[PDB]
C-alpha cells in the first residue's frame, strides 16, 4: 500500500479519454506494487525486463 503524505506530483488518473478537474470516483488503476527501484544505475548495460 501507499504510505501517506506522498505528493504523487507526477501521478495522474488512468483515463483513456475525457478530463476531470475535480470530483471523486472508485475505479481500477495500476497502483498495486510488486517491487520498487529508484535512481537506477545499470540500465545503460542493456538491462532487460
Amino acid at each position: 500500500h501507499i504510505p501517506e503524505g506522498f505528493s504523487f506530483n507526477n501521478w495522474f488518473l488512468l483515463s483513456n479519454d475525457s478530463t476531470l478537474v475535480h470530483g471523486k470516483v472508485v475505479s481500477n488503476q495500476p497502483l498495486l506494487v510488486n517491487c520498487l527501484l529508484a535512481i537506477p544505475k545499470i540500465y545503460g548495460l542493456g538491462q532487460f525486463f
Binding site: 495522474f12 475525457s18 478530463t19 478537474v21
Partner: protein
C-alpha cells in the same frame, strides 16, 4: 457564411492520393448486360492507408453503345466517400475487394437506360477510430501545423472529432494535465494548446 476553424493534434503535412477505379462494359453483351467489371484501388484488390493526410479519388469507366448510365451506390456503413472527404480524422483504415470481418461492404449500381440496371462489386473497409488518418478535399501546401483557427468570431469548427458552431477565446486559467475538457452533457468547453499550452 461561416468561417471555418480546424484544429487537431499539431503536426506537419504528409498527404497521399489514393485512387479507386471502377470499369464496366455493356456495348457488346446486351447493351444492358455486362461484359466485364474491373475495380482497382491504386491498381490493387486491397490496400492500407499510409499517410496521416490523404484523399480518395474515384474514377468511372463506361463502355456501351448508348453511352448513358445512371449510377447509384448502396452502403451498409454510416460513411460515404463524399462525407469522409470532409476532414474526417481517424486512426486506422484498409480496403479490400475480398470479404473481411468488421469491414463495411459497399456496392455500386449503374442503369444504362437500356431497360435494366446492374450492380458491379462489393468493397470491404475495416477501420478503427482515432487521430492518425484524416481525409481532406485537398492537401495543405508546405504546412508544418495543418490546424487552422481564428478567435473573436463565431466559427464552424471540428476539434479532435468534435465539431460544432461557436465562438472561441483564450483564458489564462492553466492546468498541468488534460488537453480537452468536456461538459458533463458532452460539450468540450475549454481546451489547451498542445504545442504551447495556451
Amino acid at each position: 457564411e461561416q468561417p471555418i476553424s480546424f484544429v487537431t493534434l499539431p503536426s506537419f503535412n504528409a498527404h497521399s492520393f489514393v485512387n479507386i477505379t471502377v470499369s464496366a462494359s455493356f456495348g457488346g453483351h446486351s447493351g444492358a448486360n455486362l461484359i466485364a467489371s474491373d475495380t482497382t484501388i491504386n491498381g490493387f484488390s486491397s490496400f492500407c492507408v499510409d499517410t496521416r493526410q490523404f484523399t480518395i479519388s474515384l474514377s468511372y469507366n463506361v463502355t456501351n453503345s448508348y453511352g448513358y448510365v445512371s449510377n447509384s451506390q448502396d452502403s451498409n456503413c454510416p460513411f460515404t466517400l463524399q462525407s469522409v472527404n470532409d476532414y474526417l480524422s481517424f486512426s486506422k483504415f484498409c480496403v479490400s475487394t475480398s470479404l473481411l470481418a468488421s469491414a463495411c461492404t459497399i456496392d455500386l449500381f449503374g442503369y444504362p437506360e437500356f431497360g435494366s440496371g446492374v450492380k458491379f462489386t462489393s468493397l470491404y473497409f475495416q477501420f478503427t477510430k482515432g487521430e492518425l488518418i484524416t481525409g481532406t478535399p485537398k492537401p495543405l501546401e508546405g504546412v508544418t501545423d495543418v490546424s487552422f483557427m481564428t478567435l473573436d468570431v463565431c466559427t464552424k469548427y471540428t476539434i479532435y472529432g468534435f465539431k460544432g458552431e461557436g465562438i472561441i477565446t483564450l483564458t489564462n486559467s492553466s492546468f498541468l494535465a488534460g488537453v480537452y475538457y468536456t461538459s458533463d452533457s458532452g460539450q468540450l468547453l475549454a481546451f489547451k494548446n498542445v504545442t504551447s499550452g495556451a
